Design a protein around this nucleic acid. Structure first.
Lengths: 152, 336, 345
RNA sequence: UGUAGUAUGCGGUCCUUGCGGC
């Protein structure tokens, strides 16, 4: 009886604490991350999950169809907006592709494939379930970001 | 010389590219705009999915506007039957209906989050611009607030010195230190008036006898609070959404483009000296052009006189206050 | 138990927000839905409440037409309860008790429930057609095999209630089974030169079948006449798509209206601190069907004009045909307005 | 069991030269 809600909460707490600790000095980075987190579900519901991920990648000045989440470093960007976008993309894609971990209750809907490349050549039902999971995890992430992270 | 990509699933990107190349005929504007958003890559190595970069796939701005308006016009019969049913719904209640043309450009819903970063309120089924009833009610309430503050500023400030002191203390708490600077300008009067109308409605009982001249009629504070309602009492005037008349869409375009060119953007955001070494960052956004005619309707639940007063207030607000976005630049203004 | 049953069809003229209040997802203020399926429904409690409010307003305004004759509640109550006719009237004047006809039909007001039970029983507004954007055929009405199966079950229940087997097999000639990437769509939605359709996010191959869509159109025509809420029913027979169950669930869960609203504070003219929130709305031009069952009234010494159940059936049908009602919240800002049409078999 | 509307109050706002030079 291991509810996925516990995994969602643990992963969201871990990622928000990670960004808080790594960028405790950069208040503007925290504000940008919080704003992007609480605005992402609207973008996903409007234009879809793949469009949202491609929008994040474009804001990262990175090419699409040739970039996965494992090969991006969120801290390797000078701009605060790029920092926050990279962190949000990494967190969302990590939850979608691996979950809280291999040994955890939730291991991610995608086995290990990049969520964008997964969305490119999968059925509508799979991308719908992925969108639902992304909505839930983004809700938890926004909750925790509003909890700890400072507001821009 | 531009590379177009589509982050939608496979076997659908081909149809999206056919729609954007005008090879096929799409009929829903919101569908092509939102669910089939293209990512355009120019000489710069970045797939910017913004209207400024989206328009690069067309010959010019005129071609983009023509394509958008043709897609909008392809659903004219369905929009006509929808507007007929909407008018029937209007006449079902004792609703007063008035038509108003757009004196200047109008844009409602510009602040909505989207891939383009500059959205527009389009009806989901038919893809036509419209004004939500919430926006009309809010603009009418704020016009009433502004009228009350301009006319009865000192009076309400004196009557509610406790409330104005509470607001000043709150502002000092949030707005930096500002221990007692808190200028008693018109904005503070508007804020305390809104606070009275929102959380302190009952204390507004004494003020209810006041009257303010709007247009040719006179409206009481009690009339306004009855119209809009409180946390404990529901409003009596139903504000319906506004939709353009289907006839005008056949001849003149119902959607055009507008540009914002923020020079000195780092000066505004980061703090660099303005100077002139601040190459602009143009951003385009959709907006319904001036002259487009909209139909508004306000219904009553208790008294038709309140409906007439609300109609007059809304007409005055649309003539002076303006609805939509960027109202400080004269956008979203209506004329008789 | 029950005697007759009528079918109420609700066509959402404006977006409808039947609030639920259970927690808050990313799209705050979710609409009420069936938990196990996720399909959006309007619970019987809210529909009965709004119908009762409209009936009370009509009776107090003296606008209810019974047997083509106007109904004055005061004189009828005097003819029924002459001993206490004044006192009961005072209760209506003080809102303690609802007027006579509403108390007969919808049951007595909250101030006193042991006297009798309601003569009417509304049903949950199960969805029938969903408006989904399409590339061709600007928007389409969508249905699912579970939807038509539940409609057939509802028809079976109506036949059992009325002991009329003739109407039982009206829809009993429609069995379907569709893959997740197949649909039975009208000619308008079908792409030109390509046997495929696009429903707002998906390319679906057009499955070839005509009996099912023809029978569905015939059933809708029988239920709601030849006028389908302001337009002829035959004019929309080419804009109907039957999709897979999962696809329909995804449409009902993700294609609903999401409306962002803010509060503007006059101190600065900008959105206030935490003054923004999202609301979920049923899309405009959606169809919800509900069952309204009626039996013998539970009151005593009833007027002759409402003596039997059929006298309630005809009154309800005439008073709730092609009318306009408000469902859910945001009434003041023009949300939740729906055209209601009452039909019988 | 019977009677019972998750409803009322809330503006997707605020901020930006279609320019620079021949």
């Amino acid at each position: 009886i291991r509810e996925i809600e516990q995994e969602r909460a643990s992963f969201a707490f871990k990622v928000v604490s990670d960004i808080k600790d790594k960028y405790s000095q950069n208040k503007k980075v925290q504000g940008k991350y919080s704003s992007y987190a609480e605005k992402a579900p609207t973008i996903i519901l409007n234009n879809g999950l793949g469009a949202t991920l491609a929008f994040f990648l474009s804001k990262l000045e990175k090419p699409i169809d040739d970039v996965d989440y494992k090969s991006i470093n969120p801290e390797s960007f000078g701009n605060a907006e790029n920092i926050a976008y990279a962190f949000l993309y990494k967190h969302l894609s990590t939850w979608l592709a691996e979950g809280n971990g291999k040994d955890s209750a939730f291991s991610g809907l995608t086995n290990g494939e990049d969520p964008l490349k997964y969305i490119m050549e999968k059925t509508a039902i799979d991308v719908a379930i992925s969108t639902e999971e992304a909505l839930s995890i983004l809700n938890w992430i926004k909750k925790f970001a509003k909890a700890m992270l400072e507001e821009e | 010389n531009v590379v177009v990509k589509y982050p939608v699933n496979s076997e659908l990107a081909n149809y999206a590219e056919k729609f954007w190349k005008k090879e096929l005929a799409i009929y829903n504007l919101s569908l092509i705009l939102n669910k089939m958003t293209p990512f355009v890559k120019r000489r710069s190595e970045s797939y910017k999915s913004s209207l400024s970069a989206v328009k690069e796939i067309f010959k010019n701005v005129d071609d983009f506007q023509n394509f958008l308006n043709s897609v909008l016009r392809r659903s004219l019969d369905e929009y006509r039957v929808f507007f007929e049913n909407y008018e029937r719904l209007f006449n079902s209640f004792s609703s007063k209906i008035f038509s108003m043309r757009t004196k200047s450009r109008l844009v409602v819903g510009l602040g909505d989050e989207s891939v383009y970063e500059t959205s527009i309120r389009l009806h989901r089924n038919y893809g036509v611009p419209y004004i939500p009833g919430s926006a009309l009610k809010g603009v009418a309430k704020h016009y009433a607030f502004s009228i009350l503050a301009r006319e009865n500023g000192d009076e309400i400030l004196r009557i509610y010195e406790s409330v104005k002191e509470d607001l000043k203390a709150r502002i000092a708490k949030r707005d930096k230190i500002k221990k007692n600077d808190v200028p008693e300008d018109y904005y503070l009067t508007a804020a305390v008036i809104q606070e009275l109308f929102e959380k302190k409605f009952d204390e507004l009982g004494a003020i209810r006898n006041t009257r303010v001249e709007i247009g040719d009629t006179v409206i009481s504070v009690g009339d306004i609070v009855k119209i809009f309602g409180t946390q404990k009492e529901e409003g009596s005037v139903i504000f319906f959404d506004a939709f353009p008349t289907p006839e005008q869409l056949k001849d003149k375009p119902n959607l055009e483009l507008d540009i914002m060119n923020p020079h000195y953007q780092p000066y505004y955001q980061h703090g660099e000296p303005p100077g002139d070494w601040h190459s602009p960052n143009p951003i385009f956004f959709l907006t319904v052009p001036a002259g487009v005619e909209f139909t508004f309707a306000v219904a009553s639940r208790d008294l038709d006189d309140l409906a007439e007063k609300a109609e007059k207030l809304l007409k005055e607000a649309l003539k002076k206050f303006g609805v939509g976005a960027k109202t400080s630049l004269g956008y979203g203004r209506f004329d008789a | 138990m029950f005697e007759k049953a009528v079918v109420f069809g609700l066509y959402s003229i404006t977006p409808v927000h039947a609030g639920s209040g259970a927690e808050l997802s990313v799209i705050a203020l979710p609409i009420q839905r069936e938990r196990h399926t996720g399909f959006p429904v309007i619970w019987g409690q809210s529909l009965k409440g709004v119908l009762r409010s409209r009936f009370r307003q009509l009776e107090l305004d003296e606008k209810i037409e019974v047997e083509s004759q106007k109904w004055k509640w005061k004189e009828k109550t005097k003819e029924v309860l002459k001993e206490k006719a004044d006192e009961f009237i005072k209760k209506v004047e003080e809102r303690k008790r609802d007027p006579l006809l509403t108390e007969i039909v919808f049951g007595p007001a909250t101030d006193g429930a042991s006297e009798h039970a309601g003569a009417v029983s509304v049903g949950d507004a199960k969805i029938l057609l969903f408006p989904v954007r399409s590339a061709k055929g600007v928007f389409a009405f969508v249905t699912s095999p579970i939807v038509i199966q539940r409609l057939k079950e509802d028809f079976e229940l109506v036949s059992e209630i009325e002991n009329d087997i003739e109407l039982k097999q009206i829809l009993s000639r429609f069995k379907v089974e569709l893959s997740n990437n197949e649909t039975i769509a009208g000619n308008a939605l079908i792409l030109n030169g390509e046997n495929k359709v696009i429903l707002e996010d998906i390319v679906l191959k057009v499955k070839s079948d005509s009996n099912v869509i023809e029978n569905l159109v015939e059933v809708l025509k029988t239920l709601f006449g030849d006028n389908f809420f302001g337009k002829p029913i035959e004019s929309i027979k080419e804009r109907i798509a039957i999709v897979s169950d999962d696809v329909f669930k995804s449409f009902t869960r993700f294609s609903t209206e999401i409306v962002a609203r803010v509060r503007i504070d006059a101190e600065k003219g900008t959105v206030a601190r935490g003054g923004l929130w999202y609301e979920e709305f049923l899309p405009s031009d959606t169809l919800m069907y509900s069952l309204i069952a009626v039996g013998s009234p539970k009151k005593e010494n009833l007027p002759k004009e409402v003596d039997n159940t059929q006298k309630i059936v005809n009154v309800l049908k005439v008073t709730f045909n092609n009318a306009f009602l408000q469902i859910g919240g945001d009434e003041t800002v023009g949300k939740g307005f729906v055209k209601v049409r009452a039909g019988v078999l």
